[PDB]
Design an enzyme around this catalytic site. Structure first.
Site, PDB file in Angstrom:
ATOM      1  N   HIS A  58      -7.519  -5.055  -1.347  1.00 49.78           N
ATOM      2  CA  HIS A  58      -6.397  -4.155  -1.110  1.00 49.78           C
ATOM      3  C   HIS A  58      -5.294  -4.694  -0.119  1.00 49.78           C
ATOM      4  O   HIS A  58      -5.808  -4.752   1.136  1.00 49.78           O
ATOM      5  CB  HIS A  58      -6.511  -2.776  -0.869  1.00 49.78           C
ATOM      6  CG  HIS A  58      -5.598  -1.673  -0.476  1.00 49.78           C
ATOM      7  ND1 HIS A  58      -4.644  -1.447  -1.643  1.00 49.78           N
ATOM      8  CD2 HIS A  58      -5.185  -1.052   0.473  1.00 49.78           C
ATOM      9  CE1 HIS A  58      -3.757  -0.661  -1.018  1.00 49.78           C
ATOM     10  NE2 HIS A  58      -4.017  -0.333   0.161  1.00 49.78           N
TER      11      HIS A  58
ATOM     12  N   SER B 108       0.775  -1.285   0.052  1.00 53.80           N
ATOM     13  CA  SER B 108       0.207  -0.040  -0.058  1.00 53.80           C
ATOM     14  C   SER B 108       0.762   1.184  -0.193  1.00 53.80           C
ATOM     15  O   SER B 108       1.619   1.439  -0.992  1.00 53.80           O
ATOM     16  CB  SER B 108      -1.105  -0.025   1.189  1.00 53.80           C
ATOM     17  OG  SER B 108      -1.971   0.875   1.314  1.00 53.80           O
TER      18      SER B 108
ATOM     19  N   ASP C  40      -8.282  -4.662  -6.134  1.00 51.11           N
ATOM     20  CA  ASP C  40      -7.887  -3.635  -5.284  1.00 51.11           C
ATOM     21  C   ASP C  40      -8.678  -2.220  -5.842  1.00 51.11           C
ATOM     22  O   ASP C  40      -8.753  -1.715  -6.789  1.00 51.11           O
ATOM     23  CB  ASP C  40      -6.383  -3.351  -5.452  1.00 51.11           C
ATOM     24  CG  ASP C  40      -5.877  -2.347  -4.263  1.00 51.11           C
ATOM     25  OD1 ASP C  40      -6.566  -1.532  -3.934  1.00 51.11           O
ATOM     26  OD2 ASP C  40      -4.653  -2.736  -4.056  1.00 51.11           O
TER      27      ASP C  40
END
Ligand SMILES: [Ca+2]
Length: 558
Positions: free
Chosen positions: A483, A180, A447
């Site tokens: 994600h 991330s 995601d």
């Protein structure tokens, strides 16, 4: 150096010639070996060092410093490890060396020396109620630079200096793993500080993070016509645009069109390129009854309204300005937009653009949440602080000819743009590659924070700028995954073992074993699959248990 034994309690406490003269050590403590717990592997006996670099006062009157925590085991494997961050950072982890992928083992439990940072601000201190809470570090130009690149540089240097002093030698190899915001950090390091780390894992990397809020304004405005009800500020409830059952219907239609394009009907869209060319929810059929997915009349539980279909098509297309020029990228249709395990619907896709359905307020990250707030205060230049209650309205009023330009602007004491300090879009990895550096990228297809197709586009540009790029950098897309984790896919994997093998033995990962953290999405007790280096996908061998990795191989799409 103190005349004390190396790698000992004495050498540890003596740490309290730093590369940065403004380094202050607050803790230098010997830690006994700690047993394993339900959520963490056992930690060996080690030295724990924590402190701060460059304590100062920002132009906003708030205090700022770069916090770090470092752990150095008494029994050391000669390797140095830094973990990446998450969100807008601002917190200091236990610093045992998380490797992501749903893994319970830390790098410290594998006898690495491990370090972490908070990125230059502190969520407990840099919480300004006039500047949208914990994103308020964006009011200070230097805190932005620390967030973008400087904090990780200073902490890497400090950690390596402590390692050399504590052990009497430098680390043989250095490794960085992040997902991330931590994936952005990994790519940034490969581009800006190529000699810092020999091996980098960058998962779901936000390498164009200042553009996320542009996508968020776009998906918010795209979904608003499908909303039902208003929040307390009179703004449409984006979370009401699709129920969980509606999203599951969309995912089932994607599977009906796309599941078998890899050769095997198994609830997973391995052939993501063929899916993007094939699927259109305005023409797609509901596979269960053969009727069109889009309602021909009133809304039923088995169809989506034309307003819903228009809305999600527009959101997935990506933001454009008035001339039709793309401002970010498009998003991939994938089954992990939903998922059903028992009676529990997958929330890991919809939480980003829509928010939880069962709420009378907007709570999507991109509507009123931290992503919209971070864009206004951290990435727009000059920053645009405002009441928290105005954020959703600001996204609704976002002007795609004027507002997107603010991530390229400088103003006053903000002498770099947010794309300057936070972006990591360079494909000049010659220095990283030439010194032996290896990079593993990964990204979940479902995601909704950062587009997996955008990471794929960076990787294509990388290969075009550097022939033979697969010799040092490979990309592993994960069908069904949200994600960094979750979703109907094989979202769990050990990224550290193949990274070490590539860096130290030249063994490139031709596949990476993965397994599903929620196999109930497929009605099974377990599912293991190979992750494949881009552009390859998993191919079933034609017989045997479809939930066993041994019956699959990586191959070009059909
Ligand atoms: Ca399939």
């Amino acid at each position: 150096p103190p005349p004390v034994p190396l790698a000992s309690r004495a050498a540890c406490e003596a740490l309290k010639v730093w590369p940065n003269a403004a380094t202050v050590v607050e803790v230098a403590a010997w830690r006994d070996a700690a047993p394993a717990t339900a959520s963490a592997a056992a930690l060996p006996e080690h030295c724990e060092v924590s402190g701060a670099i460059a304590k100062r006062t920002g132009i906003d009157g708030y205090p700022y410093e770069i916090k770090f925590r470092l752990r150095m085991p008494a029994e050391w494997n000669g390797r140095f490890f830094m973990e990446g961050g998450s969100g807008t950072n601002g917190s200091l982890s236990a610093a045992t060396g998380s490797i992501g992928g749903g893994q319970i083992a830390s790098a410290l439990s594998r006898n690495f020396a491990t370090i972490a940072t908070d990125g230059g601000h502190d969520n407990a201190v840099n919480d300004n109620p006039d500047a949208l809470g914990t994103v308020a570090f964006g009011l200070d130009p230097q805190a932005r630079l620390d967030m973008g690149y400087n904090s990780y540089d200073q902490v890497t240097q400090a950690g390596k200096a402590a390692v050399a002093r504590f052990y009497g030698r430098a680390a043989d190899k250095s490794y960085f793993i992040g997902c991330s915001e931590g994936g952005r950090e990994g790519m940034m390091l490969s581009q800006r500080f190529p000699s810092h780390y020999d091996g980098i894992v960058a998962g779901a990397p936000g390498y164009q993070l200042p553009k996320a809020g542009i996508s968020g304004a776009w998906t918010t405005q795209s979904l608003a016509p499908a909303a039902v009800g208003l929040d307390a500020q009179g703004v449409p409830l984006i979370n009401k645009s699709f129920s969980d059952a509606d999203l599951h219907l969309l995912s089932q239609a994607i599977l009906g069109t796309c599941d078998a394009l890899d050769g095997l009907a198994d609830g997973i869209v391995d052939n993501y390129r063929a899916c993007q060319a094939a699927f259109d929810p305005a023409t797609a059929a509901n596979p269960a009854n053969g009727q069109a997915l889009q309602c021909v009349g009133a809304k039923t539980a088995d169809c989506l309204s034309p307003v819903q279909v228009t809305a999600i098509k527009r959101a997935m297309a990506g933001p454009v300005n008035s001339a039709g020029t793309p401002l970010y990228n498009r998003w991939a249709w994938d089954a992990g937009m939903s998922g059903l395990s028992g009676t529990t619907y997958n929330q890991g896709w919809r939480s980003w653009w829509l928010g939880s359905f069962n709420s009378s307020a907007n709570n999507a990250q991109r509507v009123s949440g931290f992503s919209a707030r971070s864009w206004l205060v951290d990435f727009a230049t000059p920053p645009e602080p405002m009441p928290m209650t105005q954020v959703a309205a600001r996204m609704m009023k976002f002007d795609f000819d004027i507002d997107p330009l603010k991530i390229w602007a400088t103003s006053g004491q903000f002498t770099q743009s947010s794309m300057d300090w936070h972006g990591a879009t360079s494909t000049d990895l010659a220095a990283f590659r030439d010194r032996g550096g290896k990079m593993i990228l990964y990204h979940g297809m479902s995601d909704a924070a950062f587009s997996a197709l955008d990471t794929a586009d960076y990787y294509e540009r990388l290969g075009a700028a550097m022939p033979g790029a697969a010799g040092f950098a490979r990309l592993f897309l994960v069908p069904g995954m949200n994600h960094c984790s979750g979703g109907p896919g094989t979202d769990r994997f050990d990224m550290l073992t193949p990274l070490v093998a590539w860096v130290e033995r030249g063994e490139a990962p031709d596949q990476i074993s993965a397994w599903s953290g929620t196999p109930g999405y497929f009605g099974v007790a377990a599912r293991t699959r190979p992750l494949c280096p881009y552009p390859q996908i998993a191919r079933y061998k034609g017989s045997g248990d479809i939930n066993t990795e041994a019956n699959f191989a990586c191959a070009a799409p059909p």
